């Protein structure tokens, strides 16, 4: 039956475990340590009223967007520390924002359950809302741009959806999850994406067929943030169980855990470096931590915030790392 | 070049105008008091919404209610269209002034669910700061449903039998002592959860609220006064 099929899947997982002789840090113990990685607030973009809850970088790796529950959507400039736009919002409760690779449009996923899409470079030069993507019943946790026209949107009604803007309807629906789908990251090759939910599981979906290609259930609690490994065969999950984990597609098995007994708070955000040695985790014990990805050792601390770290974003080239928090202060780090 | 200087001057003008707009909105955001409304459906959220509408706006999903009393404006958020699980969107309501919590008085079976809801509110890591106003709604129908009889509280709550009335404000329940013992048991049962733990950084403000209670927005007002004043009295020692 289904239980016998689950036993068969446990057998295949045990076969992959027999393929898994030693740990990755055990395998890469011939490779020496990364070393200490200090960092400092190279700029401090201040100017929010309420808690900054999510940010997104640009593909220029120069301009970025941050969103807070006051009702402001602020495009910061990292280099000059000047705010390019600050869109006033219809509803204050905003749980994410996203920034088009073309740079023209900014998305605003909110708890009003309507996604909003805004055009920055308008002909008139005055910024208004382009369209209102409305097909969800739960709050909108995360959203990312597939292309300039296609957008992937997770929500709290346990379904992801892929959307086209001028059409105005859900092109594809992603309904496999039971818990609230709360994080997503999309691959560089862009035809496949991943999503973790509150049911301690990640599904990876082909964006054309819209079905769960693979399911991973390593975690023990809610999963707050997820991020692809850069070269595309793996991804990391940051989850409320105070553990972080690196998961692989090709082996179909988890590889690495990232845990220390003294830290107990849940991971809120996660990001990678460009090379992928250097994993970055926001936290509720007020300090971002940064891990060697291939030894699972705490390389360092990036502590400058007074409250919980909501959002964490690495540039494409990989120099700057922006971070926000509920102290309303956004800071750019090395 | 000179064009780079022109771009820098344009960026300076844009950041100055944007900071001016944000500085103008800072005062109106700081002045207006935000109020989460939470509760069960049979507990009359909608009727007290109608009472503040005695005293456009996006009705999609969340409902909003505006009311001002004594030159102070309260903007009060009802989480309507959202799905039933609340472990994650209740984190979004951190910086709010006070969590109004509404309980149906009359029917004793869902009171245990409301008590577990209150205990979950009180011990949450992000909701430990916020003072919780408490409302006990449809107070008359409680009195009718106990004075009609044949409906034992004792079956649901066994500690009612080993309970007596501590103190009261007598003329309103002066028709009956046993309804007084009932409703004051309900107050006491919430306050066991309220005074269970903490360091006195957030407080429970119970009110015995009928269907027809007009001025109860001002009771909301005065106990917002108590919460903000206690916040400031802690703010003296904190800085």
């Amino acid at each position: 039956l289904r239980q016998e099929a689950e036993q068969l899947k446990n057998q295949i997982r045990d076969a992959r475990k027999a393929c898994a002789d030693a740990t990755l840090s055990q395998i890469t113990n011939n490779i020496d340590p990364v070393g200490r990685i200090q960092m400092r607030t190279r700029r401090t973009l201040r100017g929010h009223l309420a808690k900054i809850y999510a940010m997104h970088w640009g593909t220029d790796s120069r301009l970025l967007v941050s969103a807070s529950q006051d009702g402001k959507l602020i495009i910061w400039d990292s280099y000059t520390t000047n705010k390019v736009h600050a869109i006033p919002l219809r509803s204050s409760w905003v749980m994410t924002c996203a920034y088009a690779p073309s740079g023209n449009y900014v998305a605003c996923g909110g708890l009003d359950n309507i996604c909003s899409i805004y055009n920055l470079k308008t002909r008139e030069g005055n910024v208004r809302v382009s369209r209102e993507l409305a097909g969800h019943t739960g709050y909108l946790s995360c959203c990312r741009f597939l292309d300039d026209n296609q957008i992937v949107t997770s929500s709290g009604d346990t379904t992801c959806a892929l959307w086209d803007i001028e059409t105005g309807q859900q092109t594809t629906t992603f309904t496999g999850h039971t818990g609230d789908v709360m994080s997503l990251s999309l691959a560089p090759d862009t035809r496949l994406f991943v999503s973790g939910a509150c049911d301690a599981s990640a599904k990876l979906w082909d964006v054309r067929e819209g079905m769960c290609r693979q399911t991973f259930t390593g975690h023990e609690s809610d999963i707050n943030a997820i991020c692809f490994f850069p070269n595309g065969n793996a991804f990391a999950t940051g989850s409320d169980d105070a553990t972080c984990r690196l998961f692989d597609l090709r082996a179909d098995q988890e590889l690495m855990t990232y845990s220390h007994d003294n830290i107990i708070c849940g991971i809120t955000s996660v990001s990678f470096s460009k090379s992928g040695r250097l994993l970055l985790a926001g936290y509720d014990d007020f300090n971002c931590n940064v891990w060697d990805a291939l030894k699972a050792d705490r390389a360092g601390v990036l502590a400058g915030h007074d409250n919980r770290v909501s959002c964490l974003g690495v540039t494409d080239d990989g120099m700057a790392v922006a971070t926000g928090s509920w102290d309303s202060f956004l800071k750019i780090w090395n | 070049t000179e064009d780079q200087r022109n771009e820098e001057k344009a960026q300076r003008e844009a950041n100055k105008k944007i900071e001016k707009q944000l500085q103008k909105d800072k005062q109106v955001y700081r002045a207006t008091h935000r109020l989460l409304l939470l509760g069960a459906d049979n507990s009359g959220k909608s009727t007290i919404v109608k009472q503040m509408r005695i005293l456009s706006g996006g009705t999609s999903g969340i409902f909003e209610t505006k009311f001002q009393v004594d030159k102070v404006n309260f903007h009060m958020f009802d989480v309507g269209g959202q799905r039933d699980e609340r472990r994650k969107w209740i984190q979004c309501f951190n910086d709010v002034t006070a969590i109004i919590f509404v309980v149906d008085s009359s029917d004793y079976n869902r009171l245990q669910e409301a008590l577990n809801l209150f205990k979950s509110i009180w011990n949450n890591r992000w909701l430990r700061t916020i003072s919780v106003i408490l409302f006990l709604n449809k107070q008359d129908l409680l009195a009718e449903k106990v004075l009609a009889g044949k409906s034992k509280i004792e079956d649901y709550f066994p500690e009612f039998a080993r309970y007596t009335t501590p103190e009261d404000a007598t003329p309103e329940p002066g028709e009956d002592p046993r309804v007084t013992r009932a409703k004051y048991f309900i107050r006491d049962e919430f306050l066991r959860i309220s005074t269970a733990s903490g360091d006195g950084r957030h407080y429970c403000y119970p009110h015995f609220t009928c269907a027809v209670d007009t001025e109860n927005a001002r009771r909301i007002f005065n106990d917002c006064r108590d919460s903000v004043l206690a916040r400031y009295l802690d703010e003296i020692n904190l800085l």
Epitope: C198, D199, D222, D240 | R87, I121, N124
Partner: nanobody, 126 residues
Amino acid sequence: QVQLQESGGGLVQPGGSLRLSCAASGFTFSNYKMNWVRQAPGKGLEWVSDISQSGASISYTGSVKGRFTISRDNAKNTLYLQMNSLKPEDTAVYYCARCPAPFTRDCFDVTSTTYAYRGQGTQVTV
């Protein structure tokens, strides 16, 4: 992989005393706090029993307060709910509910129909 199976339960004589177990795997059992939640037919879900991560502190719903008992064996990694002096309306489906967060006093376990950390449940009959 998180794992919850109940054991025990079924039909018994109406005055009888019935012992149930909940096995939990895929996490440290020590830090989470356990609940039992019962579903009578034609009803909503209801929280019945609560016990902390330690097991020193404990809480019961009002109906079955003096009647039933709950125990945890963290080293043995098991949960138990024993019913004593059974009453005929208490027949229900007895889910084992795991609290979402660790090191956390509050939970939001009893929900509409769906929840990640409930067990599949067993049905008891008077």
